[PDB]
Design a binder for this molecule. Sequence first.
Ligand SMILES: Cc1nc(CCNC(=O)N2CCN(C(=O)c3cccs3)CC2)sc1C
Length: 121
Amino acid sequence: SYDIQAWKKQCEELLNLIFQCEDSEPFRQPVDLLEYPDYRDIIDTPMDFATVRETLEAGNYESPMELCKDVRLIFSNSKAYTPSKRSRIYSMSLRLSAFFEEHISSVLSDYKSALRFHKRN
Ligand SMILES: Cc1nc(CCNC(=O)N2CCN(C(=O)c3cccs3)CC2)sc1C
């Protein structure tokens, strides 16, 4: 299964599943800085799933590892901003993280396998 390009469509499809999850609602667009005016005091690098999809479609990811870093930043930003570990929006983050990690594991393994096959000789 040694297609070096296959990760891109696999990531498009997973982003589609994440957009159809009710748990993604708060993470679809960049945070509302009018409702959270202290948000940039806490969070240095905002990230959201629309920004991830646009960066993919622009051809500005070279690997699924770079996409995975930006998705993991959505989740670390939610954990850093939350005033409590039982909060609603943080709770949605944990379920969505578990879903994402379950699905991205094979995408990463197949990509890394394809690159090793390319350099085999
Ligand atoms: C429809 C629409 N949606 C937008 C973005 C909505 N995102 C936020 O407002 N967040 C999500 C990230 N976040 C958190 O993780 C936490 C808050 C509380 C505990 S954690 C802060 C609030 S803008 C727009 C036009």
